[PDB]
Amino acid sequence: KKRASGVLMHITSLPGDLGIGTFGREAYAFVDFLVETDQKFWQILPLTTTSFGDSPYQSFSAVAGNTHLIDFDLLTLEGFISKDDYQNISFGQDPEVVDYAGLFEKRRPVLEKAVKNFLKEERATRMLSDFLQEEKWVTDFAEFMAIKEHFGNKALQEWDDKAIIRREEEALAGYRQKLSEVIKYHEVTQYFFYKQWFELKEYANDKGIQIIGDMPIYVSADSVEVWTMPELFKLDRDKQPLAIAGVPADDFSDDGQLWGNPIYNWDYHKESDFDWWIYRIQSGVKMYDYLRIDHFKGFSDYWEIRGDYQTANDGSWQPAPGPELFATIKEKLGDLPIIAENLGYIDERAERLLAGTGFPGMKIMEFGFYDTTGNSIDIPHNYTENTIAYAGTHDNEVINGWFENLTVEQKAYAENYMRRLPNEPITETVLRTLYATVSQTTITCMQDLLDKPADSRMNMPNTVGGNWQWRMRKEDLTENRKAFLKEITTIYNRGN
Ligand SMILES: C[C@H]1O[C@H](O[C@H]2[C@H](O)[C@@H](O)[C@@H](O)O[C@@H]2CO)[C@H](O)[C@@H](O)[C@@H]1N[C@H]1C=C(CO)[C@@H](O)[C@H](O)[C@H]1O
Ligand SMILES: C[C@H]1O[C@H](O[C@H]2[C@H](O)[C@@H](O)CO[C@@H]2CO)[C@H](O)[C@@H](O)[C@@H]1N[C@H]1C=C(CO)[C@@H](O)[C@H](O)[C@H]1O
């Protein structure tokens, strides 16, 4: 099977003057750079909307576009805004750190000006409606966001009007009439998102560059889905989670993870023929070229923290109907370009899930040198072709960081195994080895390609301070870094 490689960089980490990466010029420059180095894949994070904490895996909707990624420049070149509208409206102090606090604050006059100008165009409504016909989910997400803003950006569970919380049709007809202009705002911003995003995906595809999108297993409890389709979750009459999502402690840290997402009533799914999941996967394979389903473990056995928790260890391992779901997807959708994220808590039910799909799974080389015997299943000599290998992912340390926190016997052993040449930064070491593996695809974390320090980690699971904030200086993508990436891509036979 044809070998290949790709780069792991979220749209947020692109550089720019808007305080956050955009579907704008530097995105097209990033594509240009991927074709320079004969890459195959661009892996991004999810493009969904974000909450407090700025995680895209706890989202107001499973399909809506994060509006922070809309580009003001592309919007100016359209006749919708001008640039005396965002020239010197500085979004953030440090270029290589996003400040999400108040960036939603600062984009809003600008986006509103653009939506007001888009609607006054004479063909406006027949373009917007022609859009809503292909993405039919838009309007009720837009009403969700409007009602949320009316109640002061308060969670769905703590709104004030219990009638609207459970969508009584008189209350609904009142809110959609009383708030029709702020709703149209959110419809139009979704139209902007999709127009710009599919422009970028088309540029990428026609240069031979393919996009690996991320699909979060769970949505947040503060969601248009918990609102319009509560029968998918274990919730009560006032729509609060009976049990929440998480993961228990494993052998390298004792407190585990509490996530907060609602839990699935997988029985309603099995009965409903997994309708909603077929729709998620279908819109995923249209949004992307390769879909990466997060937390594959959750389709065999998910961890279910009850209410009245004190830590996340107060839960259980519940059964999900993985086999049936994926047979249904195969039958109804054909076979599809999915890669499965199967890290952690692997038991033979999960290994059967994988074997039954034939999707590639993951190999995170950073987990595979903690045991100097060589027996770790994440050590390079145990990889097979049908896997996607990473140095780390966005939840692991950057390689420069991982290398600090090693037993000096573990350091010695790792420098042995990988044949580190003296006077050589170990990010280039690790990446040489990663690309030498028999894996069909290997992905390089744009942090480590530029040799960035421990500060640059994208996520650190089970915290909220300072996450999803890394951006990359254009100053740091020296011709030397690019030449290094092209070299490892040619030497180990993974080009184009
Ligand atoms: C990523 C993973 O690391 C730790 O778990 C185990 C490794 O994944 C295993 O392969 C093996 O080496 O044992 C490790 C335990 O020491 C950690 O305990 C897990 O919690 C962690 N996985 C969680 C994090 C995710 C972020 O993507 C989820 O994808 C994953 O489903 C969670 O379980
Ligand atoms: C929303 C959580 O996202 C992350 O967990 C991800 C994981 O990183 C992915 O690879 C797979 O999906 C899970 C979620 O589906 C974070 O690791 C996790 O910390 C995030 N939750 C944070 C946000 C809140 C807000 O209430 C807290 O409740 C939660 O405990 C906190 O960790």
Author numbering: 2 to 497
Original paper wording:
Therefore, we determined the X-ray crystal structure of SaAM in complex with acarbose to gain an insight into its thermostability and catalytic mechanism. Eight chains of SaAM were identified in the asymmetric unit, and the results showed that all chains are similar. We found two ligands present in the active site. The first ligand is an acarbose molecule that had reacted with the catalytic nucleophile D295, cleaving off a glucose residue at the reducing end, resulting in an acarbose-derived glycosyl-enzyme intermediate at D295. The second ligand is an intact acarbose molecule close to the glycosyl-enzyme intermediate. The 4-OH group of the non-reducing end of the second acarbose molecule is around 3.9 Å away from the anomeric carbon atom of the glycosyl-enzyme intermediate. Therefore, we believe that we have captured the pre-transglycosylation step of the catalytic mechanism with the acarbose molecule resembling a non-reducing end attacking the glycosyl-enzyme intermediate. The alkene moiety in the non-reducing end may have caused the 4-OH to be in a sub-optimal position for nucleophilic attack, thus allowing isolation of the catalytic intermediate. The interactions of the enzyme with the 2-OH and 3-OH groups of the non-reducing end help position the 4-OH for nucleophilic attack and also block the 2-OH and 3-OH groups from reacting with the glycosyl-enzyme intermediate. Thus, our novel structure also explains the regioselectivity of the transglycosylation reaction.
Amylomaltase (AM, EC 2.4.1.25) is an intracellular 4-αGTase that catalyzes the intermolecular (disproportionation, coupling, hydrolysis) and intramolecular (cyclization) transglycosylation reactions to yield new linear oligosaccharides and LR-CD or cycloamylose (CA) products, respectively. In the present work, a novel AM from the mesophilic bacterium Streptococcus agalactiae (SaAM), with 18–49% sequence identity to previously reported AMs, was characterized. SaAM has the conserved catalytic and substrate recognition residues (D295, E342 and D396, SaAM numbering), which are found in all AMs. SaAM is phylogenetically grouped with AMs from the mesophilic bacteria, but has a similar size to AMs of the thermophiles.
